[PDB]
Ligand binder design. Structure first.
Ligand SMILES: Cc1cc2nc3c(=O)[nH]c(=O)nc-3n(C[C@H](O)[C@H](O)[C@H](O)COP(=O)(O)OP(=O)(O)OC[C@H]3O[C@@H](n4cnc5c(N)ncnc54)[C@H](O)[C@@H]3O)c2cc1C
Ligand SMILES: Cc1cc2nc3c(=O)[nH]c(=O)nc-3n(C[C@H](O)[C@H](O)[C@H](O)COP(=O)(O)OP(=O)(O)OC[C@H]3O[C@@H](n4cnc5c(N)ncnc54)[C@H](O)[C@@H]3O)c2cc1C
Ligand SMILES: Cc1cc2nc3c(=O)[nH]c(=O)nc-3n(C[C@H](O)[C@H](O)[C@H](O)COP(=O)(O)OP(=O)(O)OC[C@H]3O[C@@H](n4cnc5c(N)ncnc54)[C@H](O)[C@@H]3O)c2cc1C
Ligand SMILES: Cc1cc2nc3c(=O)[nH]c(=O)nc-3n(C[C@H](O)[C@H](O)[C@H](O)COP(=O)(O)OP(=O)(O)OC[C@H]3O[C@@H](n4cnc5c(N)ncnc54)[C@H](O)[C@@H]3O)c2cc1C
Ligand SMILES: O=c1ccn([C@H]2C[C@H](O)[C@@H](COP(=O)(O)O)O2)c(=O)[nH]1
Ligand SMILES: O=c1ccn([C@H]2C[C@H](O)[C@@H](COP(=O)(O)O)O2)c(=O)[nH]1
Ligand SMILES: O=c1ccn([C@H]2C[C@H](O)[C@@H](COP(=O)(O)O)O2)c(=O)[nH]1
Ligand SMILES: O=c1ccn([C@H]2C[C@H](O)[C@@H](COP(=O)(O)O)O2)c(=O)[nH]1
Lengths: 213, 213, 217, 214
């Protein structure tokens, strides 16, 4: 499963340990369908969250640095990110669509906003390449690159922390760009743990956007 | 995979996410056996351990409470343990064998030590049952039960935290009982992640027992 | 500041970093900004009401706690904290056990009088402790000998915990679903917290606290 | 109180601290305070055998001003608490890290180092002015700021215990880390040394894995 986000971003599922029944086994402390689904709803509605820690996902995410900086604030998880030190990278940037400013009253037309952003990233990127060409080390030259540069990372996270992420990021108080990523994460979560996801929405989910879409 | 430990304990593998290549994929943010095995060694040698967080195990453990108390000090992991509140329990107890007092200079035969331990355990257990029958709530009556009572738990842990656990517990400074569990944990780890386990022993393992066995 | 709990237990405050204003400082950096008492106290309520918890991680406590192992076994489940505990492997354990009072059984139909429940618990404790001492005297290593001791043995530990994790602890343990014994420890923890961080504590009770017992102690 | 300037406009400021060397001694001893010689000796013993949990009871709060590319590396340290200035919620000041010509010493460049410095300040100036224009035209801040470069300074509070701080030093007070973060780590180390002299000395002698604090 892969879902494209923004103009060049994505979220894709790399691996998963378990399914809804992994939470059921942990709660019962037993290795050996209505009953089980009812236990999931019961745990969720009574705040018994620790069984959900035994379901784990690994995602591969392509996102602009400003979005990754917000994302990497979630400390109960594991991350590995691309570094120019290890690997030569592709350099792509998030250019908002004009519809991103819809609902805002700007004195510049939205399409011109889009153009001004593309222009400044083109100039920044070209300054970077000239510095590289002239023998400036990469770790110094790259400091002129803008916050909308795309990066990629692996993210390994258990369902309990993932639910916290959805509470905070699949919510209208979160910035629009990361909301879009959170929606893709939720869609994958729902696919792999349908019972847990339905119970979370019904009983524990604190945000607004997953109830309207 | 299930390994018997002590007189009634065990370590059982429940699930695993990933294998050695999960660490390699996360490190590169992406098979070539020679180069992949070499990367794993490189990471281990230079202390870049975050890629090993993307391998995850779930175990099912049966152990005495005094061993579990030591084990549960490892905070970077997930636990769910049996409680009498939700499950009726079997009541079994770890009685050391005379060989456990191999080469301790004692004034009483080792076999008699075993006998005295069995006696007091039996009497405590009888008392527990008398209190229960007489209407005392379980949460109060159980306070007479000794530290060698067996419990069971699920343990979900990533390879980085598992390696820390091995460093500290598969070691002669740890108590003999938890060493035996750690050896079983090491055996399962080695089976599922042979390249990581060998690199660990070669470059990062600080303990003194896993290179002996 | 030391509060006695159960028959021989306690919670004692060892140290504290920060106060209510630590969280105000941390919150304000978001907007590139302390102000004054009314606005700063108002911010603490705002944060608590809207679920902004991270600013409270900058308030930290160290407690010294003496408690029965069955209580410590529950307490030590709180992983977002630091612990150091008395070792039964390394030290010779004192004759200190939690013997509940007869009132502990108030509310329960027993076929034995509660005073007799109390005496039966004491008897088994004494037999177990006697056995332990005799094993030790025979040269049985301490870490093996102690396995016969009951779960009501008292242990001691240091606990360092920030206010956000401490509030999670209060939600879960200052609550009627927790065992009565740990409730008593959580009431003491709450009293110390209220003493050092009155604004945070008050706003927590008013907007964020999910438990029941603190709203009426 | 304690404040150390870093780079052209950055700093590390110590806001608060809980505990001292004796806090770790107290914490360790509960397993089994005495005098200064045996207590100093215990700290070295703990460091030597990798008994690190006692050091978690020593806690610092720092106030840090650093460029975003530095903060990006710093915030990978999960065993800590952060609160940071927001470009979504606040209008950002004209504060950017412009490296000095000396930052390029030992690298052979086809432009003089001086000109590299000028080229960097030019691109940041253009980027910042674009940001301001967008804000003035009514673009929300959270979108306007996406054109700003990685050398924009941010500010944050960092609360961290001595054990995690030693891990940070091992990794960042080290020649394999980027020069800019090394400079911050040197400042953290100087503060640590001042507040926990016995722990810091024991750390250097027995546990420190890096190469610049010596
Ligand atoms: C709408 C919005 C606006 C924001 N604005 C800002 C801002 O202006 N500035 C800013 O710095 N950040 C901001 N954040 C980030 C926010 O403060 C958190 O850093 C982020 O949401 C991660 O949340 P978390 O701590 O719950 O997740 P994780 O770090 O993944 O933690 C998961 C859970 O574990 C616990 N936990 C983990 N570590 C600790 C610890 N050390 N102490 C106590 N408990 C812990 C908590 O229970 C937490 O819920 C914002 C976030 C949102 C959603
Ligand atoms: C031989 C032996 C004797 C022991 N004796 C005692 C004793 O007498 N008394 C006693 O109380 N304990 C004792 N312990 C327990 C020991 O102090 C640790 O609690 C246990 O080994 C878990 O180690 P940990 O913190 O590395 O593991 P985890 O808790 O799983 O943490 C893993 C890693 O994450 C980091 N970490 C996690 N949380 C934090 C945090 N809050 N701050 C900083 N870093 C963090 C550390 O890098 C740590 O290595 C003993 C352990 C051993 C092996
Ligand atoms: C009334 C009651 C009954 C209980 N019964 C049982 C039982 O029968 N069996 C049993 O095993 N336990 C039981 N527990 C213990 C319970 O499951 C938790 O272990 C304990 O309450 C600690 O809560 P915590 O995880 O919120 O706290 P902490 O471990 O301190 O964690 C604090 C917060 O950080 C986050 N967090 C920390 N680590 C992780 C992680 N690895 N993944 C995701 N998020 C994380 C969560 O947001 C969490 O709320 C019971 C507790 C109570 C109060
Ligand atoms: C020279 C250098 C180059 C680097 N290059 C890259 C790169 O190319 N790509 C990249 O993504 N990152 C890179 N990093 C970042 C690095 O991978 C770590 O994220 C960073 O050093 C923080 O280290 P930490 O995990 O030990 O610290 P913290 O996250 O503060 O953790 C402290 C300790 O707690 C334990 N711990 C915490 N959380 C967990 C968990 N979830 N599971 C198991 N144990 C845990 C570990 O014992 C750890 O040592 C680099 C760092 C350095 C210094
Ligand atoms: O919605 C937000 C706003 C801020 N932050 C965190 C991420 C950064 O560490 C810092 C500033 O982020 P910006 O507001 O500049 O995106 O605060 C978030 O995580 N989410
Ligand atoms: O080898 C040890 C010794 C102690 N402890 C921790 C576990 C307990 O929380 C506390 C006391 O354990 P005992 O020494 O009583 O087993 O210290 C361990 O984890 N391992
Ligand atoms: O109220 C409770 C009940 C259980 N547990 C945890 C502690 C043990 O790890 C396990 C069993 O505890 P008891 O039910 O035996 O107290 O579950 C708690 O933390 N609190
Ligand atoms: O020295 C380094 C190199 C990389 N990273 C981490 C931070 C980012 O999450 C990712 C890429 O960082 P840069 O190489 O772009 O700085 O790896 C560090 O923390 N320190």
């Amino acid at each position: 499963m892969k879902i494209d986000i923004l103009d060049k971003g994505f979220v894709e599922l790399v691996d998963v340990m378990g399914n809804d029944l992994s939470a059921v086994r942990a709660a019962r402390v037993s290795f050996d369908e209505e009953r089980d689904r009812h236990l999931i709803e019961y745990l969720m509605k009574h705040g018994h969250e620790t069984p959900f820690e035994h379901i784990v996902f690994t995602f591969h995410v392509k996102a602009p640095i400003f979005v990754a900086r917000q994302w990497f604030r979630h400390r109960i998880a594991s991350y590995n990110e691309l570094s120019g030190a290890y690997s030569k990278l592709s350099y792509e940037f998030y250019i908002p669509s004009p519809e991103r400013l819809e609902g805002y009253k700007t004195t510049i037309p939205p399409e011109r906003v889009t153009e001004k952003i593309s222009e400044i990233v083109d100039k920044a990127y070209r300054t970077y390449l000239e510095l590289i060409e002239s023998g400036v080390p990469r770790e110094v030259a790259r400091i002129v690159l803008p916050l909308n540069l795309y990066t990629r990372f692996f993210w390994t996270v258990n369902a309990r922390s993932l639910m916290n992420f959805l509470n905070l990021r699949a919510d209208s108080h979160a910035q629009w760009e990361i909301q879009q990523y959170a929606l893709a994460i939720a869609r994958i979560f729902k696919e792999k743990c349908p019972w847990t996801f339905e119970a979370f929405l019904k009983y524990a989910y604190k945000g607004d956007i997953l109830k309207e879409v």
